[PDB]
Amino acid sequence: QAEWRSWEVNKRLEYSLVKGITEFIEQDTEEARQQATRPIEVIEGPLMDGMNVVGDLFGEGKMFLPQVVKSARVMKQAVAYLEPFIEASKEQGKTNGKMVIATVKGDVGDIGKNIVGVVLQCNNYEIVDLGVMVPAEKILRTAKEVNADLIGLSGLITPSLDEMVNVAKEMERQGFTIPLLIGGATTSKAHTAVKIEQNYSGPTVYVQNASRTVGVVAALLSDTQRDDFVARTRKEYETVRIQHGRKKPRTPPVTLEAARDNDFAFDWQAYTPPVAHRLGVQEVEASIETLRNYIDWTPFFMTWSLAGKYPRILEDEVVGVEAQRLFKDANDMLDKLSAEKTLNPRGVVGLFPANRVGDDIEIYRDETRTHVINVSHHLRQQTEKTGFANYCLADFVAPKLSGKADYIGAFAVTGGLEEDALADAFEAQHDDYNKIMVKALADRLAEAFAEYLHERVRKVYWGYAPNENLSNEELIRENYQGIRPAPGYPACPEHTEKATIWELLEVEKHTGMKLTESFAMWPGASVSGWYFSHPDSKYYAVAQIQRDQVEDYARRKGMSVTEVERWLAPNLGYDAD
C-alpha cells in the first residue's frame, strides 16, 4: 500500500525533494540520519542532490518558480528537523556564500525578495533576510556582525532609490569591499549605473530577476570570474552612462508658464460635470468572494516568474500546465481564506466637491464651495508640445472661474490587515511556498478591490454611468469613462500626496491602514489614489520637469526646493543637485 515508500531512504528523500512531497519529510530525513554517521550528511547527501535536479530541470525549462520554492519547502523542513543534530555535531556543513538581503528604508515591498531569498538558498547560499524598512545602518552593521560576502537591497517605490544611493555612499564611507547587489520594482540597469555605482568603490551590480541573480552571485564569489566580471560590468555601466547623457536631439524643454499656457483646451461653459450622487466619506466592505471575480491574474503569474497573460497562459506550451497548477493552489487558498474569514479586505472611499486653481484641485467643505479643506497638488509635463496639451491632471476638473460644478474622489484599500500575521505563520512552519502565496493573493485581492470600488463608484457612489456592465476582461482594458490616478505612478509621481488622501478619508481610522517614512503603505497589499470623472481624462505621464516648476511646487506644498528635488528625483529634467 505505497510505492516509492520501499526505496533506499536516500533516493526517497532525493525524490520527495524534486516533487515537493512533504508528508514523509519528517520520518524520511530522520531515518536517513540514523543510517548516517554525522548529522550533516543527509544534507550534502540526498537533499543537496535532490536540489541539483530541480536546478537541472529549471534550466532546460522543464520546471518553474512555483515548484522550485515548493521543493525548498521540503529542503528547509528537512534541515529544520536536523537542527539539534547538525548543531550538536561536527563541522556542520558549508555554503557558496552568505548574503544580507533587505528591503531598503521606508519601503515595505518584499515578495520579489523572498523569491530571490529562496531561489538562493536553493543553490546552497545562506540568506539573512533583515526584512523591510531596514536602516542603511542595520544593513551594513549586520553585514559586519555576520561577516557577509554580499549585500542585497530590495526596493519598490520611487523614494527607495535615494535610500540605496544612501547605502552605497555609506558602503563607500564605511570602507566596505563586498559587492552591492541592487534590485526591486524601481531599480534599473540605467538608474544603478548613473546614480549608484559611481558612489561605491566596490562592485555594484543590478540584476533583473531571481533567476539571473544566481548567475551574478556566482561570478561575484568565483575565485576566477570575479575580476573578469565586475570589470565587464563597470565598463558596461559606462557605455549606458554616456548614452544617457548624450542629451539626444531631445525636444527642447519649455518654461513653466508656457506649458501652463498650453493647457488642456476644453469648452467648459458647454459641459456640465456629472454631479457626484453621494457626497461624503464612506467605509465600504467586500468579501474575498465578491472580489475574486475582479482579479487580474496576469501580474499574479508574473509574480511567479511564469510569463504570458491569462487565461492564454493556461494553454501555453512549456509552462502552461504548472500555470494551471499554480493557478489552482492559489484559488484553493483563497477559498479557505474567504470562508474561515482569516484575511479580510477593507477599504475607504470618498467624494468631495472640487475645482481647479493653477495646477491643483481645491477640495471643498460642503456643496457651498466656500471653504477649502484640502489641496491636491499636481505636476505638469514640461516638454515642448505642439498640437497636444501639456497635460496636468488638474486640468480634467472644471476650473474655479468657470463656476461650473465639478467633483473629485479618492480611496485606499488593502487585501487584508492580517496579511503580515498570516505570512509570518508560514515563515514559522518554514512554508516558503505558502508564505509567498498568501501575500501574492492579498495583492491580487487588494488590486482587486481598487477595480471593484472604482466600478462601484463609477456606477453608484459617483453615479455618472449607472448602466455599465463591462466584463472583467474589459475592466482590465480601462474601457470606462474616467481614471483613478494613484500617487507614485508617472501621471502623478509625487508620493507625498498620499498623505492628503489619508487626511481626507482619515484612512487610519476606517481601515487601520498606515503610511511610513517613505509614504509607502501598510499593509503591503494596499492601493490608494484619486478618482476623476471627466471622460477625456487619461493616464498621461509627467516626464521631466525643469527648475522653475520644482520651485513653484516647493511653495505650493510649502517645502524646500531641496525636499522636493528628493521626492521628485526621477522626473528632474535638470542636474540633480
Cβ 439 to ligand B12 shortest distance, Å:
7
Cβ 202 to ligand B12 shortest distance, Å:
15
406 and 272 Cβ atoms separated by less than 8 Å: no
130 binds ligand B12 (CB under 6 A): no
Kindly give, in sequence order, each residue whose CB lies less than 8 Å from that of residue 364, ignoring residues fewer than 6 positions away: 352, 353, 354, 355, 370, 371, 372, 373
112 binds ligand B12 (CB under 6 A): yes
Given 72, 111, 313, 441, the residue binding ligand B12 (CB under 6 A): 111
Closest CA to 49 of 24, 14, 82: 14
Cβ 51 to ligand B12 shortest distance, Å:
18
Given 204, 338, 390, 528, the residue binding ligand B12 (CB under 6 A): 528
Given 322, 431, 447, 497, the residue binding ligand B12 (CB under 6 A): 447
Cβ 431 to ligand B12 shortest distance, Å:
18
511 binds ligand B12 (CB under 6 A): no
Given 63, 68, 74, 207, the residue binding ligand B12 (CB under 6 A): 207
486 binds ligand B12 (CB under 6 A): yes
Q: What's the grid cell of residue 479?
A: 474601457
Cβ 133 to ligand B12 shortest distance, Å:
10
Binding mask 176-195 for ligand B12 (x = CB under 6 A): -----x-xxxx---------
Binding to ligand B12, residues 379-418 (CB under 6 A): none
Closest CA to 43 of 32, 27, 35: 32
Contact region for ligand B12 (CB under 6 A) — 4-12, 267-275, 299-307, 400-408? 299-307
165 binds ligand B12 (CB under 6 A): no
Cβ 249 to ligand B12 shortest distance, Å:
26
127 binds ligand B12 (CB under 6 A): no
Tell me what percent of the chain is helix, strand and coil, each rounded to the nearest 5. 45, 15, 40
Q: State how far the Cα of 200 lies from the Cα of 177, in Å rounded to an integer.
A: 9
Q: What's the grid cell of residue 284?
A: 465600504
Closest CA to 30 of 50, 12, 48: 12
Distances (CA, A) of 432 to 289, 416, 429, 516: 25, 20, 9, 26
Contact region for ligand B12 (CB under 6 A) — 140-148, 203-211, 276-284, 340-348? 203-211
20 versus 159: smaller Cβ distance to ligand B12:
159
152 binds ligand B12 (CB under 6 A): yes
47 versus 115: smaller Cβ distance to ligand B12:
115
Please state, as a whole number, how many other Cβ atoms lie within 10 Å of the Cβ of residue 81: 19
29 versus 71: smaller Cβ distance to ligand B12:
71
Q: State how far the Cα of 17 lies from the Cα of 532, in Å rounded to an integer.
A: 52
391 and 380 Cβ atoms separated by less than 8 Å: yes
Given 55, 299, 358, 573, the residue binding ligand B12 (CB under 6 A): 299
Given 39, 46, 106, 109, the residue binding ligand B12 (CB under 6 A): 109
Our measurement of the distance from residue 283's CA atom to the centroid of its chain's CA atoms, rounded to an integer in Å, reads: 26
Our measurement of the distance from residue 355's CA atom to the centroid of its chain's CA atoms, rounded to an integer in Å, reads: 33
400 and 357 Cβ atoms separated by less than 8 Å: yes
308 binds ligand B12 (CB under 6 A): no
209 binds ligand B12 (CB under 6 A): yes
Q: What's the grid cell of residue 531?
A: 478618482
Q: Regarding beta strands 98-103 and 150-155, do their DSSP bridges make them parallel or antiparallel, or are they unpaired? A: parallel
379 versus 446: smaller Cβ distance to ligand B12:
446
Cβ 157 to ligand B12 shortest distance, Å:
5
Given 74, 398, 417, 446, the residue binding ligand B12 (CB under 6 A): 446
DSSP letters, 324-343, are HHHHHHHHHHHHHIIIII-S
Q: What's the grid cell of residue 197?
A: 555605482
Amino acid identity of residue 427, one-letter, is E
Cβ 322 to ligand B12 shortest distance, Å:
16
204 versus 338: smaller Cβ distance to ligand B12:
204
List b or e across 113-135, with b for residues whose CB sees 16 or more CB atoms inside 10 angstroms.
bbbbbbbbbbbbbebbbbebbbb
Contact region for ligand B12 (CB under 6 A) — 165-173, 309-317, 353-361, 482-490? 482-490
101 versus 408: smaller Cβ distance to ligand B12:
101
Say how many residues touch ligand B12, by CB under 6 A: 45
110 binds ligand B12 (CB under 6 A): yes
213 versus 549: smaller Cβ distance to ligand B12:
213
527 binds ligand B12 (CB under 6 A): yes
Residue 428's SS3 state is helix
303 binds ligand B12 (CB under 6 A): yes
Given 7, 388, 489, 574, the residue binding ligand B12 (CB under 6 A): 489
89 and 115 Cβ atoms separated by less than 8 Å: no
Cβ 485 to ligand B12 shortest distance, Å:
9
Q: What's the grid cell of residue 405?
A: 460644478
Cβ 200 to ligand B12 shortest distance, Å:
14
CA distance between the termini of the chain: 73
Q: What's the grid cell of residue 299?
A: 501580474
443 binds ligand B12 (CB under 6 A): yes
Kindly give, in sequence order, each residue whose CB lies less than 8 Å from that of residue 141, ignoring residues fewer than 6 positions away: none
Cβ 394 to ligand B12 shortest distance, Å:
18
66 binds ligand B12 (CB under 6 A): no
Please state, as a whole number, how many other Cβ atoms lie within 10 Å of the Cβ of residue 547: 17
Residue 297's SS3 state is helix
Neighbouring C-alpha atoms within 13 Å toward the C-beta of 319: 22
Cβ 297 to ligand B12 shortest distance, Å:
11
Cβ 108 to ligand B12 shortest distance, Å:
5
Q: Which residues pair with 577 in a beta bridge?
A: none
255 versus 293: smaller Cβ distance to ligand B12:
293
Residues that bind ligand B12 in the complex, under the rule CB under 6 A: 101, 108-113, 115-116, 152-154, 156-158, 181, 183-186, 207, 209-210, 213, 299, 302-303, 305, 443, 446-447, 486-490, 498, 520-521, 524-529
